[PDB]
Design a protein around this ligand. Sequence first.
Ligand code: CLA
Ligand code: CLA
Ligand code: CLA
Ligand code: CLA
Ligand code: CLA
Ligand code: CLA
Ligand SMILES: CC(=O)O[C@H]1CC(C)(C)C(=C=C/C(C)=C/C=C/C(C)=C/C=C/C=C(C)/C=C\C=C(/C)C(=O)C[C@@]23O[C@]2(C)C[C@@H](O)CC3(C)C)[C@](C)(O)C1
Ligand SMILES: CC(=O)O[C@H]1CC(C)(C)C(=C=C/C(C)=C/C=C\C(C)=C/C=C\C=C(C)\C=C\C=C(/C)C(=O)C[C@@]23O[C@]2(C)C[C@@H](O)CC3(C)C)[C@](C)(O)C1
Ligand SMILES: CC1=C(C#C/C(C)=C/C=C/C(C)=C/C=C/C=C(C)/C=C/C=C(C)/C=C/[C@@]23O[C@]2(C)C[C@@H](O)CC3(C)C)C(C)(C)C[C@H](O)C1
Ligand SMILES: CC1=C(/C=C/C(C)=C/C=C/C(C)=C/C=C/C=C(C)/C=C/C=C(C)/C=C/C2=C(C)CCCC2(C)C)C(C)(C)CCC1
Ligand SMILES: CC1=C(C/C=C(\C)CCC[C@H](C)CCC[C@H](C)CCCC(C)C)C(=O)c2ccccc2C1=O
Ligand code: SF4
Ligand code: SF4
Ligand code: SF4
Lengths: 732, 80, 168, 49, 185, 33, 131
Amino acid sequence: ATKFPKFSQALAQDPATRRIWYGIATAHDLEAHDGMTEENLYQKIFASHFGHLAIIFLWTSGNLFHVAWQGNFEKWVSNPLKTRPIAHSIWDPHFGESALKAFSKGNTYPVNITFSGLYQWWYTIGFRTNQELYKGSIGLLLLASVLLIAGWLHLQPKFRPSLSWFKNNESRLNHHLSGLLGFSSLAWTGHLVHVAIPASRGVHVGWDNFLTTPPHPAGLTPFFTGNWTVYAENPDSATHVFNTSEGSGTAILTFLGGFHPQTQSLWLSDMAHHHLAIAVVFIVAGHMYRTNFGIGHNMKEILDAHRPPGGRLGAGHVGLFETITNSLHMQLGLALACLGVATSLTAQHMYALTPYAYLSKDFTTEAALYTHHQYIAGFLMVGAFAHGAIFFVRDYDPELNKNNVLARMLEHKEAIISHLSWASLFLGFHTLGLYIHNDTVVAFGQPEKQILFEPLFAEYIQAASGKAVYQFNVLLASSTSPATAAGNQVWLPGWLEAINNPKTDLFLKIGPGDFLVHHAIALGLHVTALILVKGALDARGSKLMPDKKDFGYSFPCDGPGRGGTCDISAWDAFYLAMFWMLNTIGWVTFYWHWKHMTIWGGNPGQFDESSNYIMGWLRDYLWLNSSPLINGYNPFGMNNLSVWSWMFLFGHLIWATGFMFLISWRGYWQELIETLVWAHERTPLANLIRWRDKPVALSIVQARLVGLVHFSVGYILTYAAFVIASTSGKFA
Amino acid sequence: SHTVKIYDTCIGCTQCVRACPTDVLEMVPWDGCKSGQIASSPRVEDCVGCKRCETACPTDFLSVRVYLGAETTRSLGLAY
Amino acid sequence: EMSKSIPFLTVPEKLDGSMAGDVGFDPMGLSDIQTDLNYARWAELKHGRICMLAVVGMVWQEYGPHLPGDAYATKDPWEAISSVGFASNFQTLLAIGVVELANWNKYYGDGTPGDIGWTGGQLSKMNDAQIKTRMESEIVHCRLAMIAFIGATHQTFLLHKGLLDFSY
Amino acid sequence: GLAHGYFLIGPFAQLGPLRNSDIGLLAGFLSTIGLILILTLGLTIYGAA
Amino acid sequence: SVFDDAVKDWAEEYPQFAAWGWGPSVQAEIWNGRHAMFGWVVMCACAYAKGHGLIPDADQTLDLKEWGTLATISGKNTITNERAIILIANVHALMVGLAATISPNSFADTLLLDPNHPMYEWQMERNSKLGGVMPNLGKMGVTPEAELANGRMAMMGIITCIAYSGIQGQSMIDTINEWVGGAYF
Amino acid sequence: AASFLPSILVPLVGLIFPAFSMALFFLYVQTDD
Amino acid sequence: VDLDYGMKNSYVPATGGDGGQGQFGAQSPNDWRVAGTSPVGETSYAGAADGGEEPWFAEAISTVSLDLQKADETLKAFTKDAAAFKIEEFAAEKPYGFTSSDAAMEELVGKLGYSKFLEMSTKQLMKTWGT
Ligand code: CLA
Ligand code: CLA
Ligand code: CLA
Ligand code: CLA
Ligand code: CLA
Ligand code: CLA
Ligand SMILES: CC(=O)O[C@H]1CC(C)(C)C(=C=C/C(C)=C/C=C/C(C)=C/C=C/C=C(C)/C=C\C=C(/C)C(=O)C[C@@]23O[C@]2(C)C[C@@H](O)CC3(C)C)[C@](C)(O)C1
Ligand SMILES: CC(=O)O[C@H]1CC(C)(C)C(=C=C/C(C)=C/C=C\C(C)=C/C=C\C=C(C)\C=C\C=C(/C)C(=O)C[C@@]23O[C@]2(C)C[C@@H](O)CC3(C)C)[C@](C)(O)C1
Ligand SMILES: CC1=C(C#C/C(C)=C/C=C/C(C)=C/C=C/C=C(C)/C=C/C=C(C)/C=C/[C@@]23O[C@]2(C)C[C@@H](O)CC3(C)C)C(C)(C)C[C@H](O)C1
Ligand SMILES: CC1=C(/C=C/C(C)=C/C=C/C(C)=C/C=C/C=C(C)/C=C/C=C(C)/C=C/C2=C(C)CCCC2(C)C)C(C)(C)CCC1
Ligand SMILES: CC1=C(C/C=C(\C)CCC[C@H](C)CCC[C@H](C)CCCC(C)C)C(=O)c2ccccc2C1=O
Ligand code: SF4
Ligand code: SF4
Ligand code: SF4
C-alpha cells in the first residue's frame, strides 16, 4: 500500500478516519497482512519476542536504578520494620508548597512509597548496599542491548531461521525443560547457597570473594563422598537474628518446614533445597524426546497410540499433533491458560507461605501484590479462551480431526453449554437467595433466623494438614495417624507449629461467612466460562448463522433480519466475558481484603458476623474503610493520600464514560457528525482549513472495544486507590 | 467494495432486487428454477451493506449473501 | 565420509577441505544449521587473534619491563584493570569500537573471512598455495592461543601462581 | 499574527499561576510565546500534509 | 571508513530525514559548527564573570514564592541566581534562532534544505564542494571553507575540554581558565 | 550535577518528546507514498 | 463519451474482501482531497469557481451540471449494446421484408421513440414492424 496501513490495501484505500484507527489495531495480526508467507510470519514473530524481552529487562533495570539513586534501601536494611520503602522521587511543576511538604514527610524530598515488595525480595536474595543495586541495573541495560542486536541479526538474510527449525518440537521442549527451567534452578540454588544464606548470617560474599569463601565449612567433600547429610546439620537456631551471626547455623540444605521465627518467612535453606530438587526433576524430564541422537520419544506416535479400547473417546488423540504444530493460536491459548493458573497460584501461595522477610508485616504491599496477580490471571485466562476460538474459526481442519477427541467436543456442544448453564443458574439462585434471606431477617431484627452453613469440607482439609481448632481428629491432626508418625521426625514439627499459630496466614480460620463467598466465586467462574466456551464452540456456526466461519472471528453483525443478529460474532463473547471476569475477580479481591483488614485490625469478628448479609459488605467494608481515602484532600487541607484520592475519582469518570460507548450506538453519532461537517464547510475563515481524511463515526466493533477499555481502566484504577489508601491510611 | 454472491438455491422471487436501496441487483434469465430467472449483482460498487436484500430472501438459508469488505465513499454512504 | 581427525565418526558435509584448518572436526554438528561458515570463521580468527595478544601480554606484564609510572606497575594481570583506571581503559575501548564499526560490512559481508586489509606487504607476490599455507599457520596459532588462554587464566585463579612458576 | 498575539497575553497574565507575583506579566509573556510556538508547529505540519 | 559509504547507508536507512539535510550531512556540520564557535564565546564569558565576580548576587536561590515550583530542584530547594542568569542569556540567543528557523529571509541560509526556498540551489552547490579531510587553504578569509574549518575546530575543542576536565578531575570552567593561563580567575 | 537532571529531563520527556512524536505520526499517516 | 472514464480511476482492487470496480467504477477519477478557500482574486481547487467578492462561499457556486441535450447522448451510448441485442433478435425472427439492422432500428425507433423501443419484446416489435 501507499498509505498508513502498508499491510492492508483495503484500509489504505479508505477515504475516512477509519484508515488510521484500524491500521493501529490490526498492526500485530501479522497472519492477516497482505502477502504474508508462513516463513516470514515465524521469523518476524521471533524477532518481536526479542524486543519484548528487552523491554522487560529495561523495566527491571529502571526499578533498581531509581531505588538506588533516589531510595532508602540501606536505611530500610538497617531498620526494616520502622522505615517506609521509597520508589522514586517526584518533580511535578504543578505542585503547591503544601504538597511538597506532605509528600516529603519522613524524608527531605517529595517521594513515592513503593508497594511492590522489591525491598523485601532484594533483602532476602542478598542485596545490602545501593552500589550493588546499581551494578545490577547496568548489567541489565547491557543485556537489553544484546537482545535488540539479536532481533536484528535473525532478521538478516543469512541468519533467518528456517520454518523447519521453528517446528522442531522435541529439541525445543528438551532444551527448554532441561536448560531453561532445570539448569536455571540449579544456578539459583547456587546463588542462594553462595550469596543469600551467607548474608542472612552476617557474612558478605560478593564478586570480590566468592571464589575464596567456601559456602560450607566441610567443602564439596561431603557431596562427592555421598555423605550429603552433613549439609543439613546445624540449622539456624530459633533465636537467630536475621542479617546477623547471633544464633546462626552452618546448614545449607534442609527440610525444616515452617517459618523463620524472627522474619516470619520461609527458611532460606529450605528454599535452596527446594530448587535443587526441582532442578533434578526437570533436567531428567528434559531427556524424553528424540533429538538427533537416536534415543527418545516421538510425540506424534505417543498421541496417536492413545485411544481408549472401549471407544468411549472415539478415535482418541490422532490428528492433534498436526493441528497443534500448524496452529499458533492453539499454542498461545494453551500457554496463556497454564500461565493464568500459575499466576493465581502465585497469589494464593505467596500470602500463606510468605517467601520474603518482613513482607507479612507490610500490609499494604501484601494487599497490592495479591490483587495485582489475580487481575493479571483473569486477563490471561480470558485470552486463552479467546485464542482458542480464533483457532476454531481460522486453523481448525474438520477432516484431519475426524472423530478426534477435539471434534467430538464440538459434537456434544449443546450438552456442555446447557449443563454449564444449569450450574450457573443453580449457583446463582441459591447464593443470592440465601444472602437476601439473611439480609431480610437481620433487617427485621431477627438475626437468629439466618441460614448459615458451616464450611465443613474445607475445615476438614485444614484439619487433615494439622489444624486443631475444628476438633476433627483426622490425619495430621491425629497423633495416632500413620501419616503423623511418618513426618513427625522430618518436617511436621515446624509445620504443625505454623499451621496452629493464629498469627499466620497459613490456612486461615474459616466460618459460615466464607461458605457463601466461595459459592459466589464459583458462580463467577462458571458464568464467565459459559460465555467463553459458548463463543468458542459456536464460532464456526450456529442455527442463526450457519455460515459464521466465512465471516471471521470479529464482524459487526449479520443484519436486522432473521430476528436481529447483534453481538453474534465470537469476538463479542470475549467482549461480554470481560465484564464477568472483572466482576468475579472483584469479588475474590474484596473477600481477601476485608478478611485480612479485620484480622489486621484485631477484630476478626466483624467479618465473621457481617459477611453473612450484603449490607455488611457495603457498610462495614466499603463505607467504613473509605474514610481515609475520601479525606485525602478536604476544605481544610491535604495529605500524602491526595494522589490516591484524586485517582479514585478519576477512575469513576473513566468507568462512566465507557457507558456512553456501550449504550449509545453508531447511527445517532453519524448523523450528528454530518451536521458538524456542514458547519465547518460553511463557516468563513475556518473554511480555509480542511481535512484530508473524511470525518466519520466510530465503527460498531470499535465502539465496543473503546467502551470495554474505558470500563476496565476505570475499574482497576478505582480499586487500586481504595486498596492502597484504605490499608495505608489505617495501618500505616 | 462489498461482495454480494447469489447461490443456486434462488427461486427468482425478485424480492431482493426490489429491496435494494441502490440498484445493485438485477434479474437475469436462468433455467435452474421454475421461474426461469436468477438474481445477479452487476453493480456491487454501489452496495452500502444494508443487508435489506438478505432480509427479503425466502430461502431456508439466504440465497443472496452480502459479505462486508473494503469501504469507499459510496459504501460508507457519505454525502459529504 | 569418515573424519580425518576423528577416525570413527562421519564428517559433516560443509567441512570439505576447502577452508584452511579443515581437519574434519565438527563432532557436535554445529555446521549444518549455518548457511555458511564465513561468519564463524571471522569469529574464530578474531577470538584467536585477541587471545594471542592476551597470552603474550600476560606473560610480559608478569615478567617484563612495565611502562614508566605508578599505576602501571602491578604485575597481577587482573588487578591491572582497576589500577590503571577508567580513563585509560575507556580510550582503548573507544578505539576498538571505531575499528569494529568501520569494518562492520566486512564482518557481515561475503569477502575473505578475516581480511580487513592489514596484510602489510606480506601475502603478496605469492601463489595461491603459498597464501593458503600462511592462512593455515594463522588458524593453527589462533587455536593454540585460545586453548592456552583458558589454561593460563584457570591456572592463575586456581593455583594462584605465576605462569612461568613451575613448582611441584 | 499581530492581531492574535495582543489579546493572548491577557488571559495568562491575569489568571495564571504567578498572577500575583511581581514577575507575573513577564511570566505571562513567556507563556504566550509558548502557545504561539505550539500553534506555529501546527501550521507547519498542516502545510506539509 | 570511506565516510561516503557510511553516509549513504544512513540515508538509505533513514531516507525521510536525510531529504531535509538531517543527519550526517554538510548542512549539519556547518550549523552545529557555527553554534559551537559561538558557544566558546559564551563559555569564556561565563568563566570571566565567575572569576571577576560580575554575576549579581550569585550563590543565592530564587524565591519559591516570587517564582514557582518550576524553580525547584528538589523539594523546596531552588535554583541559584547564577545558573538562572546563564540560562536567560542562552534563552535570548535561542529566541533569535527560533525566529530564523520559522521565518527565514529570501537570502538566508535556512536550517533545512527546502526545495521551495530561493537559496536552495546555492546551498546545494556550496555543500557539494565543501567536503574534505584537510582544511583547504587558499580560500582563507570569509569563505564557506573557512567557516567549516573553524567550526570543526571548535567542535573538537568542546570534546577535548570535557575529556581533559574529567581526566584532571576539574570543572570545565577551570580547564578553560587554565588553557588561557589563569587570566579569568 | 546529577541532581539537576530531574528538572532538565522531565520537561523534555513530557512535553518536547510527545509533541515531536505526534507530529511525525501525523506526517506519516497523511503522506501518500 | 468515454464509457470507461469512471473505470479509469486510481482504485486498485485488493486480494480478497473487495467487490471490485463493478460496472461503473468504484471511485471518481478525481481526488476529493483539494484545498480550502482562497483570498479574493485567487483560485484553489484547480478548475474552481471564482468566489467573486465572496470567496468564503465559493464552494457553493456550481460548475458541474447536466445538459439535457448531452443527457440524450449519454443515454444512447450507454444503452447501445442493449439496443443491438434487441434489434438482432428481431432480425433473427424473419422480419417482414427486412432491410438492414440499422435501417430497421431507425424505422422501429422513429415510431415508439427510443426508450419504448428498449422496453419492447421482439414479438411486440415484429407486430409493430409488420408494416
Ligand atoms: C502473549 C500474549 C498474546 C499475544 C502474543 C497476542 C497476540 C495477538 N492477539 Mg491477543 N490476547 C491476549 C494475549 C496475547 N495476544 C490476551 C491476554 C487477551 C485477553 C484480553 C487477548 C485477546 C485478544 C483478542 C480479543 C484479539 C486478540 C488478537 C490478537 C492478534 C492481533 C493483536 C492486535 O491486533 O493488536 C494490535 C494492537 C493493539 C490492539 C494495541 C492495543 C491497545 C490497547 C487495547 C489499549 C491500551 C490500554 C490503555 C491505552 C491504557 C491507558 C490507560 C491510562 C489512561 C492510565 C495477535 C495475534 C486479535 C485477533 O483477531 O487475533 C486473531 C483479537 O481480536 N487477542
Ligand atoms: C446485577 C447484575 C446482573 C445480574 C443479577 C445478572 C444475572 C444473570 N446473568 Mg448477567 N450480565 C450482567 C449483569 C447481571 N447479570 C452484565 C452487566 C453483563 C454484561 C457483561 C452480563 C452478561 C451476561 C452473560 C453474557 C450471561 C449472563 C448470565 C446471567 C445469568 C447467570 C445464571 C444465574 O445466575 O442464574 C440465577 C439468576 C439470578 C439469581 C438472577 C435473577 C434473580 C431473580 C430475582 C429470581 C430470583 C428467584 C429467587 C431465588 C426465588 C425464586 C422463587 C420465587 C419465584 C418464589 C443470570 C440470570 C448467563 C446466562 O444467560 O445464564 C445461563 C450468561 O450467559 N449475564
Ligand atoms: C589483549 C591485549 C591486551 C590488553 C587488553 C592489555 C591491557 C593492559 N596492559 Mg598490556 N600488553 C599486551 C596486550 C594487552 N594488554 C601485549 C601483547 C604486551 C606486550 C607488548 C603488553 C605489554 C604491557 C606492558 C608492558 C604494560 C601493559 C599494561 C597494560 C594495562 C594498562 C594499559 C597499558 O599500558 O597497555 C600497554 C600496552 C602496550 C605496551 C602495547 C599493547 C600492544 C597492543 C595490543 C598492540 C595491538 C595494537 C592493535 C593491533 C592496533 C590498534 C587496535 C585498535 C584500537 C586501533 C592494561 C590492563 C601496563 C600495566 O602494567 O598496567 C598496570 C604496562 O605497563 N601491557
Ligand atoms: C597449551 C595449553 C597448556 C599448556 C602448555 C599447559 C602447561 C602446564 N599446565 Mg596447564 N592447563 C591448561 C592448558 C595448558 N597447560 C588448561 C586448558 C587447563 C584447564 C583450564 C589447565 C589446567 C592446569 C592446572 C590445574 C595445572 C596446570 C599445570 C600446568 C603445568 C604442568 C602441567 C603438567 O604437569 O602436565 C603434566 C602432563 C602429564 C602428567 C601428562 C603427560 C602429557 C601427555 C601424556 C602428552 C603431552 C604431549 C602434548 C603434545 C603436550 C605438548 C603441548 C605443549 C608442549 C605445548 C604446565 C606449565 C599444573 C601446574 O602446576 O602448573 C603450574 C597445574 O596444577 N594446568
Ligand atoms: C474549562 C474550564 C476551566 C477554566 C475556565 C479554567 C481557568 C483557569 N485555569 Mg484551569 N483547569 C481546568 C479547567 C478550567 N480552568 C481543568 C479541567 C483542569 C484539569 C486538567 C485544569 C487545570 C489547571 C492547572 C493545572 C492550572 C490551571 C490554571 C488556570 C487559570 C489560567 C488560565 C489560562 O492560562 O488560560 C489561558 C486561556 C487562553 C489562552 C484562552 C482563553 C479562551 C478565550 C478567552 C476565549 C475567547 C472566545 C471569544 C470571546 C470568542 C468571540 C470572539 C469575537 C468577539 C471576535 C484559569 C483561572 C492555572 C492557574 O494558575 O490556576 C488558577 C494552572 O496552573 N488550570
Ligand atoms: C511533563 C509535562 C509537563 C510539564 C513539565 C508542565 C509544566 C508546566 N505546566 Mg503543564 N500540563 C501538562 C504537562 C506538563 N506541564 C499536561 C499534560 C497538561 C494537560 C492537563 C497541562 C496543563 C497545564 C495548564 C492548564 C497549565 C500548566 C502550567 C504549567 C507551568 C506551571 C509552572 C509555572 O511556573 O508556570 C508559569 C509559567 C512560566 C514560568 C512560563 C514557562 C515557560 C514556558 C513553559 C515555555 C514553553 C515553551 C515551549 C518550549 C514550547 C513547546 C514547543 C513544542 C514543540 C513542544 C509549568 C511550566 C500553567 C502555566 O502557566 O502554563 C505555562 C497552566 O496554566 N499546565
Ligand atoms: C605525564 C606524562 O607525559 O608522562 C607519561 C609517561 C608515560 C610513562 C608514557 C606514562 C604512560 C603510560 C601511557 C601513556 C600508556 C598508554 C597506554 C595505552 C594507550 C595502552 C593501550 C592501548 C591498547 C590497545 C590498543 C589494545 C588492544 C587492541 C586490540 C587487542 C585489538 O585486538 C584490536 C583489534 O584489531 C584487532 C587487532 C583485530 C580486529 O579484527 C579486532 C580488533 C578491532 C578488536 C605515564 C606515566 O602515564 C605518563
Ligand atoms: C519417570 C521418571 O522420572 O523415571 C526416571 C527416574 C530417574 C531416577 C531420574 C532415572 C534415572 C537415573 C538413574 C539411574 C537413577 C537411579 C538412581 C539415582 C537417583 C542415582 C543413580 C545412582 C546412584 C548411585 C549409584 C549411588 C551412589 C551413592 C554412593 C556411592 C554412596 O552411597 C556413598 C556412601 O556410601 C558411602 C561411600 C558411605 C555411606 O555411609 C554414605 C553413602 C551411603 C551415601 C530413571 C530411572 O532413568 C528414569
Ligand atoms: C564509528 C564510525 C565513524 C566514526 C566516528 C566518529 C569519530 C564519530 C564522532 C563524532 C563526533 C564526536 C562528533 C562531535 C560532535 C560535537 C558536537 C556536534 C558539538 C556541538 C556543540 C554545540 C552545538 C555547542 C553548543 C553550545 O553553544 C551552545 C549551544 C550553548 C553554549 O552555552 C555552550 C556550547 C558552546 C556548548 C567513522 C570511522 C567516521 C565511520 C564509520 O563508518 C562509523
Ligand atoms: C478454548 C479452547 C482452548 C482452551 C482451553 C482451556 C483454556 C482450557 C483450560 C483448562 C483448565 C484451566 C484446566 C484446569 C485443570 C485443573 C486441574 C486438572 C486440577 C487438577 C487437580 C489435581 C489433579 C489434584 C491435585 C491435588 C494433589 C496434587 C494432591 C491432593 C490434593 C489435590 C487437590 C491438591 C484451546 C486453546 C486448548 C483450543 C481448543 C479450545
Ligand atoms: C462519541 C461517539 C462517537 C464520536 C467520537 C469521536 C469522533 C472521537 C473523536 C475524538 C478522538 C479522541 C479522536 C480525536 C483525534 C485527534 C483529532 C487527533 C488525531 C491525530 C491523528 C494523527 C491520530 C462515535 O463515533 C461512536 C460510534 C459508535 C458508537 C458510539 C459512538 C460515540 O459515543
Ligand atoms: S448490528 Fe445493526 S444491523 Fe446488525 S442486528 Fe444489530 S441493529 Fe441490526
Ligand atoms: S446489501 Fe443493500 S445495497 Fe447491497 S445488494 Fe443488498 S440491498 Fe442492495
Ligand atoms: S429473494 Fe432470495 S430467492 Fe428471491 S430472487 Fe432474491 S436471492 Fe432469489
